[PDB]
Design a protein around this ligand. Sequence first.
Ligand SMILES: O=C(O)c1cc(O)ccc1O
Ligand SMILES: O=C(O)c1cc(O)ccc1O
Ligand SMILES: O=C(O)c1cc(O)ccc1O
Ligand SMILES: O=C(O)c1cc(O)ccc1O
Lengths: 362, 362, 362, 362
Amino acid sequence: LDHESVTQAMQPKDTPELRALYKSFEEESIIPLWTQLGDLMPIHPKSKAVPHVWKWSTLLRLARKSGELVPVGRGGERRALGLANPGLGGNAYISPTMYAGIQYLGPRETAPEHRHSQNAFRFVVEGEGVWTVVNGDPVRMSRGDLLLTPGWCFHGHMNDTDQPMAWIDGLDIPFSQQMDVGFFEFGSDRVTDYATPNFSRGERLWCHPGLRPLSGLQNTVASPIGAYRWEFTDRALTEQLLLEDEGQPATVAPGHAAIRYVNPTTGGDVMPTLRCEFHRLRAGTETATRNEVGSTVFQVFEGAGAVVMNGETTKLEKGDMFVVPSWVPWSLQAETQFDLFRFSDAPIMEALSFMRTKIEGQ
Amino acid sequence: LDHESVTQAMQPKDTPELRALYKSFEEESIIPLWTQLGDLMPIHPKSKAVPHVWKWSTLLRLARKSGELVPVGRGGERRALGLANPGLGGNAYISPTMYAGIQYLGPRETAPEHRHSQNAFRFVVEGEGVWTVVNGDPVRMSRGDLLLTPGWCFHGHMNDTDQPMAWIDGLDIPFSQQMDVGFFEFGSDRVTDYATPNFSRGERLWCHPGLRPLSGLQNTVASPIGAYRWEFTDRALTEQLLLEDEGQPATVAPGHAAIRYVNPTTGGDVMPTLRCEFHRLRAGTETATRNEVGSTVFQVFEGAGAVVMNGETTKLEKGDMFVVPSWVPWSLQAETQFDLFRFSDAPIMEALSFMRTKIEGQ
Amino acid sequence: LDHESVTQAMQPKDTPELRALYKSFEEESIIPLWTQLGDLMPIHPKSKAVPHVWKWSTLLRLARKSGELVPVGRGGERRALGLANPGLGGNAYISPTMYAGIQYLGPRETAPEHRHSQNAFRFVVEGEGVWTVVNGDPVRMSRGDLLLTPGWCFHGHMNDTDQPMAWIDGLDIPFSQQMDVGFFEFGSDRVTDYATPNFSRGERLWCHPGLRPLSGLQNTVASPIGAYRWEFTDRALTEQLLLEDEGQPATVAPGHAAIRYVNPTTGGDVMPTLRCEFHRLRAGTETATRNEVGSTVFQVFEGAGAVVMNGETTKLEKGDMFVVPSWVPWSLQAETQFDLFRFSDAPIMEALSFMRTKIEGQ
Amino acid sequence: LDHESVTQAMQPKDTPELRALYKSFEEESIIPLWTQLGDLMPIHPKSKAVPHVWKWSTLLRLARKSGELVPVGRGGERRALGLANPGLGGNAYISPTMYAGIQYLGPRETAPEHRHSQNAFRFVVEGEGVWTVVNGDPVRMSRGDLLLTPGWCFHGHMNDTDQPMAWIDGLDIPFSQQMDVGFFEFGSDRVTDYATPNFSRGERLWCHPGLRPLSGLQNTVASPIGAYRWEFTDRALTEQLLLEDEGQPATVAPGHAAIRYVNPTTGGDVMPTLRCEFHRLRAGTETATRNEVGSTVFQVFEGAGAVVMNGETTKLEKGDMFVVPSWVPWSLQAETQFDLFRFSDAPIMEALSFMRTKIEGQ
Ligand SMILES: O=C(O)c1cc(O)ccc1O
Ligand SMILES: O=C(O)c1cc(O)ccc1O
Ligand SMILES: O=C(O)c1cc(O)ccc1O
Ligand SMILES: O=C(O)c1cc(O)ccc1O
């Protein structure tokens, strides 16, 4: 049974006294339950957000043009283009939980030192030689690099070359706004440290596999790894595929290599509200259909193939971004070898025990 | 500095080419960051919900009248009156995270066996001899009793007497709706077990202080205590006040006794999304002003006194309910001995490391 | 295969040069592996301690006589009689991990305020009106009461009546000695607070089922419950048996009711090194045979029946105590209703992932 | 005050009746507390084990000679030379908790596939081209490499060259024997997989910094990293020293670089009972004196310098090994740059809340 076909027993006699009680409800800020239980409590998630794809060539065109018409600054903070879900009523929200944005930084430009409670990351698909300084620690950016900017950490963005750089912001702005959890402070209009060191202190303490500095024995809520570089991400994915060739367990599913970016102090997610993963599918691979609670977003990093969402196949190229709202059945099909970057609100669904998963063949 | 007075550097020249790019934004579901950073990222939480009080005598009048005009049933599920925040745009939400409701159950009436992912509790200020059956386990209800109804547990409500009963629902419906996390199923139109045992199985395994059944060694995400009875709550609060008389640490603050309802398997909160507490202030007590992230709601259980919210003192009687949205400075003043029941979304703010606290004298 | 029948390939030619190398080993503090792998690394635990029973009437006789011949004091600290395992080479160790002792306190006598790192508890089978003061907090003692005395907490013992009292100490002295973990300090020769309050502060904050004081929100490594009283222990066990009569899950095994004493801040064990449980078997009940890693000890609190250890049935009366060393197969058989108190080193085996369990019918 | 000078009040009158009660004690396996509280409960740890150094050139000489006189085999399992503490009564125990051993494996020799509950690691100071197969996964060994062999994992050792190899075993045999926690099984006399792959599967899934395979989302009690290679260990230590040159936090103490080997699924220790660290001191560095609960052991990997234990300076060269029993004050002084490998029983002291630390300048 469901909400579209269950017997509605309460439906009250439309008398003067009834309408007067309803007038009374309006006055006293009361809304009766009966007239809407179903809206409030669906059979399964039925998101206001809608599955949607953004074409990279489109995003690029509008990003370059923004580069012409407007400087990056101080009220607006970033020349960034936020992907707004058609189903979310004009809000700059790619899902109810996440903001997803393309930030363009033109030659020699800078962004200034700020912090907010909202958790953030920067993912670079094309570009080079911009540097984000986090809590004073300059973190070089380049193709394939995930940089983190966990909540309440100072950060600003200096471009060291005559080249523009395009990256994606991901944040829990939509969660943080709706739940009243936001704080924000100012730092400097120049980035705090103009130095351009090829690797960051955080990297240099923390990017040694299976090793922990004795000066860093305390666990952290977010990750101290300022950058997860393309190289390591690439090699991990390749080994998983080589291991598969060799008949050893590694891949998540046949032909489907994948890793999660993690906080090394805990082995858990990079930040309290956001999970990041990277996936490499072999040419020909088609993932089982999944329904998962919460929203995820992917960007095609390399290769060619397709998503299916609610049964609708959309063809996908390098750079394209799509969102799968809560519970929408989704799968991915690689034409060539298909490299994809992923973020979701899953750590929220998981901390609060709201997660569920339906997979096709089980 | 803040968002009302920082220099806005980006403000682009209003040319034809600019307006064309903006037209282009609308078409492609893009919203640029610059025109609204401040809305998105405030200096501190600035909730859409508003501090509000509901007068019990008012809620009672409208609840009784609902008892006349409408039966409790099957589409509408409950004859319950939801406290809607004036600041939340018509939604039946007392805060962005919580639903708060007054449910009236008339003589001999029943509610039927359902379950949903949404977490729930039932708190009885006046009434007797209704019974909620949880996963088949009948749980008697009476003045002062917190009953839990954790997510995904079957539940229905049979009234064993010619008396009406009034209680409050509290749920994370507003969280669960906005985050797309809701599921819902049907059970029976009679409650599953008409038996009326004076205490429930859960109570009888789990309400022995400092003792755990060896058949219940596994930890749970929600509490197995079906009911936290007035008696124990009352005695705890009294002892804390006696201990204070005796010069021993106990009270949270001078004259301010208080306890948190807990999951005994973990010592943590009753449910993943909701904290419940009970407070007893001595006559004359005035709490330090607090700002806390997330929303809380209180109901005056006994006595007389006042709240101050944003500096506005409101006088309060037995049964009244008020909400303090995220970050609104609040304090409480007891005229007589002031007993109050409390719920909040704090376990969410805390799991996700979003919590902060400003207290007056420190 | 095993160590008694595997081929020994290394066995070196007994030449002058070999004996010279062995002489050399002795000199340099070297012991070669080859000559003893099997001693060092058995097929399954093969404890030096031996299953043993102590007859209460025996312990009582020797305790009273100790009462005549010797006062309780200041070097010797306690007039206590420690159960020494025949297999543990003269040490006052009931198992390799635990000390088990019967302490006699005669009329009007006191013990003085000390503390040590070693974790301790006091369990009273017969007696009344002695009081242990813990960190200044007087904790009354009587038949059935478990008192805790966690490591590094000051404690002393005043007897308020013309009656002697007999209880059992349990401690991790044998663990703490062998692992070099012991510290010890002095407090007073009178107990710190001669007052005799019928319940202790700790009880009065913490013994309210499912409730936590807001002044005690921090988790603890040991339990803040100073006393787990007979009443609650008794009622818990009875309810589990009533629930069984009623066809509801409760008992661990058919006719076998049981509870674990717990730290309410965590739901975990009372102390880092020691687990305490209480068991009530129905007349006729015979438990499945178990092998568990680590040692346990039981005292018959009420009733009559038997243990089987390595196949040897021993008949048991009120007060008797037996130990089951690591991995010895054991079971219990109730003739009448059989009440038993239990402690083990299981939290150690469990924290370090050394635990295993073999049960007969599975 | 202490146990050498506190008043001994109990000392009973030596009468016939007293001696008869004592005779009675012996018969009934009772040992009275009074006559020995102080032995049992010292003021601070006073270990039976003694600070001791083993000279590498000595260990090497006896290891080579063992290579002549005896083959590695099947009863004796390993041609390994265990460092026995003079203070531990003939047992092959370097401390009460740990076994420390030097294993010699001659040309073309193998060890066979076994497993035991006891946790183990292999650390190579000099040697190359031996391979330990763990649960079928061949793990190459070379200078500076820590290999893990967590409890209950099959393992055997094949030497692929005409060269001998010398390494150290470290195990919790002494803990496991004394606490009755040991199990042991047989596998094959050839290692299971003669293949010699330059890196192991475990490495290849798990040695990518800040990355986790989605096929390995479950946490583990021991580490899945089969090998922590010299390279990464070396670079980590160097960066910490470069960071210090650059005025950035990194080192534990001035001139004192250091890392802990960790389980990447948790950020915690490599195994439940054993901590491993590596330290690199700058020439001239002298560490503050420490007292720590539990025993540690170090091996000088490179450089030259000294330890001080109970005030006794001993000079130290490449390969030397020393043990610091529980609570012995210790410090380290580098003459040249001083590289050292370290293991301890600290995870035990820490899980059970027995740890304490006294440091000189605080
Ligand atoms: O700092 C950033 O790059 C940033 C970018 C956004 O699109 C939104 C919020 C931010 O703080
Ligand atoms: O079952 C209830 O009593 C209930 C009451 C509400 O006001 C909202 C949702 C519910 O499930
Ligand atoms: O304080 C006690 O009652 C005690 C009794 C013992 O048998 C051994 C150590 C102790 O500290
Ligand atoms: O497998 C080994 O290399 C080993 C070595 C030892 O010295 C002691 C126990 C072992 O299992």
